[PDB]
Structure formats: C-alpha cells, structure tokens
Amino acid sequence: SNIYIQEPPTNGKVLLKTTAGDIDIELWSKEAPKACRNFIQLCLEAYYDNTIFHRVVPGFIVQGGDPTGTGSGGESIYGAPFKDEFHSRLRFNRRGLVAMANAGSHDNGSQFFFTLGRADELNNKHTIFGKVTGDTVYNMLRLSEVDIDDDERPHNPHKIKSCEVLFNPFDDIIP
C-alpha cells in the first residue's frame, strides 16, 4: 500500500452528541498534554452543554466551544490561558482535525474549532490536539450549511447535548 496516514498514534477517546449526530473525537494526549487535559476536563464537567457552533466558514473551519455565542467567551480550568503546543507531524493538511482557537499569542481556553479542508494558513499558529474517527466525520460535515446570514452565526446553530468520556487517562476531578 501507499496511502501513508502521516500522523502519530492517538491515545484517549471521547464521545460528543449534537443534533447533527454523534462525533467520536480521539486525542493525542502524549503530543499535547495540556490542551487534551483541558478538553477532557471540560467534557467531564459537562461544560459544553447548550454550547452552540457560532462560526462557520465552509471549506475552511467550523468553530465551537463558546458558551456565550459571541466569539470571545473562553474560560480554561487553569485560571489563565495556556501555551501553544506544536508538532511537525500534526499539521492542517486535511479535514476532521480539532484545534484550539487562538488570537495571536499563548491564549487558549475552551474556544476551539473543527477543520473542513486544507488550512495551510493556520500552520504553526494553533494547537492540534485531536481528530475524528471516520464513519462519523459526516455528522460534523453536516455542520457546514450556507445559512450563515453574515460571515458567521447562522439561523439555528447546532448545540452539544452531551459529552461522554470513553477513555480517561491522567485521572482528574470536576473542580
């Protein structure tokens, strides 16, 4: 074979249920400890309940993780936003990836985004910490509709109803 997946192996998997369907996000906990730690902590706190997808750029990105719905509400469980954690083997050459949304310097919290295609302008700028297992990537490809009314924020954005944790390494607590 000659397909060459070109990525390190994953560790840890969570389930996330929206009105668009079920998404099984599997993370790189070794290659990105703090971002995956914040993600599994906010999934275990049931923090992403009633969180909508407030930005859709079709073919490029679809953003989530905002409990306010304006594009600036992000609260980590660290007290302060954490650092960028890059990897040469984790780049934006394909779809289905998950990355913390950033605004310049080391500012990462609950604000993240799913990828929808080739995103070479975002390389060495955002922290890739997970992907989506295929046969379930079309539940997040249904999130990209042209109903946006603006550059972002469509009419009826999909909300996350539950967030299950299938595998949980480095045991944590909800406060």
């Binding site: 074979s1 000659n2 397909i3 060459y4 997946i5 990525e7 192996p9 994953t10 998997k13 389930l15 668009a20 369907g21 079920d22 998404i23 099984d24 599997e26 297992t133 295929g134 046969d135 379930t136 079309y138 539940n139 249904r142 299938l166 595998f167």
Partner: protein
C-alpha cells in the same frame, strides 16, 4: 445521522501501516506460482501410478510465468514529465530526419501536467428631467418644448443631424 459503535479502540490498525500487504494482483494461494507448486508437488507424489484417470485437473495430465509480486513493498514511483516530441514536426510540419527520428512525430499542442498544476492553483440637451420624453424618426427621445426650440434653432436633429422633415411624434 451516523451513530457510533461506542468503543475505545482507534480508527484503524495498531501498526499504522507497518504491514502493508500490496494485494493488487492475484493473492498467495491462488497465484500461478502456487498453482505451479501444487502441480509440481502432485507430479512428485504420483510416480508409481500409471494413468489412473482421476485426472487431477487440467495441467496434471502428465515458478516461471506469472511471478509473485513482493507483498512487502510499494514501487518507488516517479513522475516522468519529460515528453519525446518531434518539435520540428509539431510546430513546423517537416522533420529533417523523416522516419529515422527516434521521437514521436506528434502535432497535438495540448497542455501538459505541470501546466494544469500551476493553472489549478489560481433629457440630455438641456440636462433636465424628462418633460414629456418623446421620440423622432430615428429613436431620439427628446422633450416637447426643448425640441420645439431646437427646431426653432435648426430644422434637423441634434445627435446625428437627421432630416426630421417636420415629423415629430411621441
């Protein structure tokens, strides 16, 4: 919606591609080398038998041929962009070598691969309002009193000096 299986195992194999099988051709037990091995083996066993007419199959009446592909290997592929085109026959119509030239004798000047690669990556007389906009013989929409004063100025038209001939209509 596409429901999930709810498992902790990841999307694919554990080796991440370290055991590529390369099963593009006929597989191992059905390949012609295996058929020749079976035929050679059964010709080695039946020796004391002399035409038992159970007949054993087609080739057994009495590793070459289709050789087995290395299963543990991809062929190192290269893009041979460089064509062999008779340029003096393509853009001109007469090659000096005739039929002795080793090249193609082609005259199709279509796009190559790299060209596709680097192409895919990228009123009006008085200037007032239309006070009764009305026409002439030759489409010229004028006003009423302005074109009356224009006929008082000159008996022809204004745009191309057409002979109005006293004919003025809405």
């Amino acid at each position: 919606v596409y429901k999930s299986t709810r498992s902790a195992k990841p999307v694919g194999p554990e080796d991440m591609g370290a055991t590529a099988v390369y099963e593009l051709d006929t597989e191992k037990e059905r390949d012609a080398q295996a058929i020749f091995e079976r035929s050679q083996k059964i010709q080695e066993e039946l020796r004391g038998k002399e035409d038992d007419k159970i007949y054993r199959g087609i080739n057994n009446y009495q590793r070459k041929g289709p050789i087995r592909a290395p299963e543990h290997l991809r062929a190192t592929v290269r893009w041979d962009y460089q064509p062999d085109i008779c340029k003096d026959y393509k853009e001109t119509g007469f090659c000096g070598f005739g039929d002795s030239c080793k090249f193609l004798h082609d005259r199709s000047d279509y796009k190559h691969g790299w060209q596709i690669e680097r192409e895919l990556d990228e009123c009006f007389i008085c200037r007032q309002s239309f006070q009764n906009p009305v026409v002439t013989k030759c489409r010229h929409y004028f006003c009423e009193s302005c074109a009356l004063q224009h006929f008082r100025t000159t008996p022809r038209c204004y745009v191309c000096d057409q002979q109005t001939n006293g004919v003025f209509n809405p």
